[PDB]
């Protein structure tokens, strides 16, 4: 059982995102998830230090665990604490 979500890249206006299936049945830990997102979202420009934070789609809060993710929502991955407010969808 897993939640289908979509992960965007902070500040990237044209990157359509990557759908993920996420839960403890898919990843050993939140850190495991961030490390796979680092590999799959890596681009030497917008993610200069990989994925270290995950924001909700409006930047209202950071996601801190897999359980806080909700089926069918979208999320934004950042190298740092600075949420870029662009039209991801």
């Amino acid at each position, epitope marked *: 059982a897993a939640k289908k979500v979509r992960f965007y890249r902070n*500040g990237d*206006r*044209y*990157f359509k995102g990557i759908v993920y299936a996420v839960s403890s049945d898919r990843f050993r830990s939140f850190d495991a998830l961030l490390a796979d997102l680092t590999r799959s979202l890596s*681009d*030497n*420009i*917008n993610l*200069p230090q990989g994925v270290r934070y995950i924001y909700t789609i409006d930047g209202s809060r950071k996601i801190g665990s897999m359980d806080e993710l909700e089926e069918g929502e979208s999320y934004v991955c950042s190298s*740092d604490n*600075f949420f*870029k*407010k*662009v039209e991801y969808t």
Partner: antibody
Amino acid sequence: QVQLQQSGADLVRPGASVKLSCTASGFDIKDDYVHWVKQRPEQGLEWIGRIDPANGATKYAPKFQDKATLTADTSSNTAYLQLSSLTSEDTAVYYCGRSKYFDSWGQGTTLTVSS
Amino acid sequence: DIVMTQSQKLMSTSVGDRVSITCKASQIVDTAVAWYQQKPGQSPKPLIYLASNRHTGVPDRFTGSGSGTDFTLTINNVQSDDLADYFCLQHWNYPLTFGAGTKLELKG
């Protein structure tokens, strides 16, 4: 719409410094990244560097790290390209550009370095 | 320092023709490539993003294709308004690098 508005043509003597500016309307530069590029008739387009106005983070091309300094004020929605110790090779048109995609360009600034 | 090679400095064409402009990257760059049109005295106009996507306002006759190292801007049904300079750009890594430019002239 989305607009990038660069400062006027400038003529400065060699060895001096000059400040080129790029003012955004239609979006907030806090939410984006501003790039700069140099164009000469024969060398083509050369990327200068990039700034993230949200934290100040800058990235420069190898040829420009000593010569160029990128700054930005989110308050004025304005990005700045400072060029120091100007030589004859800095005579060029400079553009600012919205993001690594360059999906919006400034109109350009013709800089003439000359005594 | 990746090199974007536009081996055609000058391409001659006729109104109505199809013209294909190449750009070869010196190492794999996925689809992080863009294309731009520039006319004398004007800033570049964005045409293509992520190798194959038309920017808004770009007419149907422009198509971008390729991935890896080999990229092509295709102009079908060439118009006089399309006689201009075209360059590619990679933003797969720093520094971002442009091709040297392909000039599209009229064949006389």
